């Protein structure tokens, strides 16, 4: 894998820790640029707990790298994502995913 590029800076001090809930807004696009998912569209932040394997490896590591209040672009390879199987109907097999992720707060 996962590559992180800081779109906007964060506090730079608070970072997610294992077993700590992370609240984010994400917009997911395929490497071609086609959008397939976005929490801003649903208007509800996505909350997930690190270390529980609730999200894929790319989210795990990339969001662990990000700091509170930071907006970043995450590039996640197929191996670090749904991979060969993919997500039938949404993500084509063997696809790289690009996510615009803002880490709102930690709870």
């Amino acid at each position: 894998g996962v590559q992180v590029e800081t779109i906007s800076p964060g506090d730079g001090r608070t970072f997610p820790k294992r077993g700590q809930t992370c609240v984010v807004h994400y917009t997911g696009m395929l490497e071609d640029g086609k959008k397939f998912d976005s929490s801003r569209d649903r208007n509800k932040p996505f909350k997930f707990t690190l270390g529980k394997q609730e999200v894929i490896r790319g989210w795990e590591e990339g969001v662990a790298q990000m700091s509170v209040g930071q907006r970043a672009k995450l590039i996640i390879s197929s191996d670090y994502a749904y991979g060969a199987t993919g997500h039938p109907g949404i993500i084509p097999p063997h696809a790289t995913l690009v996510f615009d992720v803002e880490l709102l707060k930690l709870e």
Partner: protein
């Protein structure tokens, strides 16, 4: 990219996109929640809500997007709730007790001219909750394999926001229709109204709307009829026929809510009244016991009531509608008057008790339907049927309650959780009736059936189960898969096995369940043609359980069903089994396995509770003699080798490999033909012995009984039975270094084959001569008894052959010696 509103003029793209929305609906139709989740990516809830709000959108796209929202998010829950809305399981909770037919009002607490607003108030009937899952496409893909993971739930959409938006859209549509604008939303009144009304009806059926929301909807329908202590309502606004159909759907929902309220009020009054009746009866019994009751006849007549079955007691205690003295009905005047007042209130609520303004839901519906029919010659058959069904219900609401009551049921509070779980499983099973069966649907059906069987409520409330009709649903699934490729071997054998087991256990649960499943006997016999591919329960097993050990049902058995079973037996006896031939078994010419199965069913049909059913036995014997091929090649007259010779040949076949099996297996080398032939002949002799007439009839010298016994004696010679009984049985013996050499019971002569012969010998020929008794004892019984005794050592005691010998002796041989 362009603006989607450009499709108003770009007609070709408009048509293609509308058909694309139709394709989305089709792919997520009828419960494909995973595909709905997939589509949530292509059309997000933001797009869906913006499409709902959009007023410049073309009519086709507006309708397509409304329908797409309903399909993706609401269709499955709506279907489940609609399916469960027809049954009324009301728990006995304080909320249920609080329910009354008529709202407590100032003019009159009960039986006023003012009904409560339909669909508003407290309803306690059990309906399973709605289950949704977030549409998230970043969660880890389940590591579980195919069919292991739970079935996906419908994608979630904010229901409070959706209901508020739907109400606002309906209000705006009503206002615009009042204004009579020249540019209706969607380009037409139909396109403006039908989508909004469809969404509102779906939400109402789902029950998401609150009491205030229902009040607003009712005020939109009629500001006057539904009011709380603008003029144009929907029902009087000069609407097209599609909008009229949607209004008919809304009115149908509200009438159903009124019926549910009636049922719940009846259940609550039933609870209170039955509590009072039970207290009164206990007090009366106490007074009777305390009284000396010197009059023996008087005390006996008093105690007849208490000794009568509870249902009869209820009927006698309620039999005071036209008046009755204390002696005929020992219920007090106050208790009688309570029921009379409630009956008056119920009739008033139903409208049986008899201005131009409706002033009520029922008058409103009747007047509206009649007014529509008078105003225009309705050209829509669906609209005509809807309005006339509404009118029929409203003119006969008492009949509506009468037809609804059978599906009503009352349960205690303790059973609410188990009943909810059972309703969840039943809803899953019902949903699986609208999809072609596959592996995942098969797994879900098996899991649901297992959960239902494990559920406690399945035991305690068989009447509730019959009212729900889950037996018919399970049979519908089973027969769908059975008919699917009927000539071809049925796919999904284990699901048919599970369904047959569930139906057999349902029959075993209760006698009324047995009657209900017996009503469908002929159809089970229709589907019983293909069998034994499952290796477990079969529709023939279901049919047998539907009649086993039930004398009334055995008497009610139909001759045509008996002929159908006999014809199946004849076919099995005439042609070999294609499955065995494909496996590679030698072709012997006939099908002993199927023959044995049908013979077992005939045995259950003829023999009930240890005594033969004379009518069924005579019919079965006559049909078997009419079709001699049923007896098998051995008993066939022209070239039959005889029963003893056939059994010996079967023993030789079992001994010789490549003649009893393919000799090129899930269970005991599939079927061994040597054992199968003996099993068929033993089953046939058992069935004939059961068909044998009873000793009391023989002593009475009934011509039919003597004729049947003579026919059976002619069919089966006594010497053959004696010789078969005399045939030696292989027994375990120590060999090599103490290793045990046991016969393979599934592939050799076994004591049950002799037990059938003993049953036939006892029932038909009987033992009446001491010389014959000693002869049979010396030749066939005593050797087996001595072998069983010798197999009493520690090593041989628990052997399967030893246990079979013990069962054979104690069941067939020793009782015969006791009798003789």
């Amino acid at each position: 990219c362009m603006d989607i509103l450009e499709l108003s003029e770009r007609l070709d793209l408009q048509r293609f996109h509308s058909h694309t929305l139709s394709l989305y609906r089709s792919v997520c139709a009828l419960g494909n929640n995973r595909v709905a989740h997939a589509l949530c990516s292509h059309v997000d809830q933001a797009q869906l809500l913006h499409a709902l709000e959009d007023a410049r959108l073309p009519g086709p796209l507006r309708a397509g997007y409304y329908d797409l929202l309903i399909s993706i998010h609401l269709e499955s829950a709506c279907r489940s709730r609609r399916s469960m809305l027809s049954e009324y399981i009301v728990p006995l909770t304080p909320e249920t007790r609080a329910i009354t037919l008529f709202p407590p009002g100032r003019s009159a607490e009960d039986g006023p001219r003012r009904h409560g607003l339909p669909g508003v108030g407290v309803t306690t009937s059990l309906r399973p909750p709605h289950h949704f899952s977030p549409p998230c496409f970043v969660v880890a893909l389940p590591a579980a394999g195919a069919t292991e993971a739970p079935a996906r739930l419908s994608p979630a959409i904010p229901l409070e926001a959706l209901r508020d938006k739907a109400l606002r859209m309906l209000g705006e549509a009503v206002r615009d229709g009042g204004q009579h604008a020249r540019d209706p939303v969607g380009g037409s009144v139909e396109f403006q109204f039908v989508p909004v009304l469809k969404l509102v009806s779906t939400l109402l059926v789902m029950g998401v709307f609150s009491d205030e929301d229902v009040k607003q909807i009712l005020k939109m329908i009629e500001p006057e009829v539904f009011r709380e202590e603008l003029e144009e309502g929907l029902l009087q606004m000069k609407l097209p026929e599609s909008v009229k159909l949607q209004m008919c759907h809304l009115l149908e929902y509200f009438c159903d809510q009124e019926l549910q309220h009636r049922v719940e009020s009846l259940a609550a009054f039933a609870e209170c009244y039955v509590d009072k009746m039970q207290g009164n009866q206990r007090g009366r019994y106490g007074l009777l016991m305390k009284a000396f009751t010197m009059s023996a006849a008087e005390t006996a007549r008093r105690t007849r009531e208490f000794r009568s079955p509870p249902q009869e007691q209820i009927n006698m205690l309620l039999h005071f509608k036209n008046g009755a003295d204390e002696e005929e009905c020992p219920l007090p005047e106050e208790i009688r008057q309570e029921l009379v007042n409630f009956h008056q209130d119920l009739l008033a609520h139903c409208g049986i008790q008899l201005e131009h303004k409706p002033q009520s839901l029922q008058e409103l519906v009747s007047h509206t339907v009649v007014r529509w029919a008078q105003e225009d010659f309705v050209q829509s058959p669906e609209l005509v049927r809807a309005m006339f069904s509404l009118l029929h219900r409203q003119y006969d609401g008492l009949g509506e309650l009468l037809r609804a009551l059978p599906r009503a049921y009352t349960i205690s509070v303790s059973s609410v959780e188990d009943t909810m779980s059972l309703l969840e499983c039943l809803g899953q099973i019902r949903s699986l009736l609208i999809v072609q069966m596959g592996p995942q649907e098969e797994n879900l059906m098996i899991q649901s059936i297992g959960n239902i069987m494990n559920n406690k409520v399945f035991y305690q409330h068989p009447n509730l189960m019959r009212a729900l009709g889950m037996h018919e649903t399970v049979m519908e699934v089973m027969v769908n898969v059975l008919g699917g490729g009927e000539s071809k071997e049925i796919r999904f054998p284990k699901m048919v096995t599970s369904c047959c087991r569930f139906l057999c256990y349902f029959c075993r649960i209760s006698r009324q369940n047995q009657r209900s499943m017996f009503d469908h006997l002929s159809y089970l016999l229709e589907n019983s043609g293909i069998g034994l591919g499952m290796q477990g329960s079969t529709p023939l097993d279901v049919a047998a359980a539907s009649v086993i050990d039930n004398n009334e049902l055995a008497l009610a058995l139909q001759e045509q069903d008996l002929e159908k079973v006999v014809s199946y037996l004849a076919g099995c006896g005439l042609q070999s089994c294609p499955m065995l031939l494909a496996k590679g078994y030698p072709d012997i010419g006939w099908n002993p396995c199927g023959g044995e199965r049908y013979l077992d069913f005939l045995r259950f049909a003829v023999f009930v509770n240890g005594e033969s059913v004379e009518e069924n036995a005579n019919v079965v014997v006559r049909l078997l003699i009419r079709k001699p091929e049923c007896f098998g090649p051995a008993l066939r007259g022209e070239g039959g080798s005889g029963l003893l010779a056939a059994i010996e040949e079967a023993i030789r076949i079992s001994e010789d490999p490549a003649r009893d099996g393919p000799g090129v297996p899930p269970e005991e080398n599939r079927v061994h033909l040597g054992h199968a032939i003996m099993s068929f002949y033993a089953a046939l002799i058992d069935l004939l012995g059961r068909c044998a007439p009873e000793t009391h009839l023989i002593q009475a010298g009934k011509g039919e009984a003597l004729r049947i016994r003579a026919i059976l004696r002619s069919l089966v010679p006594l010497d053959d039975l004696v010789g078969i009984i005399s045939l030696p049985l292989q027994i375990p013996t120590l060999g090599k270094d103490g290793a045990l050499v046991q016969p393979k019971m599934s592939a050799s002569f076994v004591p049950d084959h002799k037990a059938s012969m003993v049953l036939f010998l006892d029932r038909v020929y009987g033992i009446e001569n001491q010389d014959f008794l000693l002869h049979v004892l010396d030749v066939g019984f005593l050797p087996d008894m001595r072998a069983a005794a010798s197999l009493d050592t520690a090593t041989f005691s628990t052997t399967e052959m030893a246990l079979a010998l013990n069962r054979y002796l104690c069941l067939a041989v020793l009782p015969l010696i006791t009798k003789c």
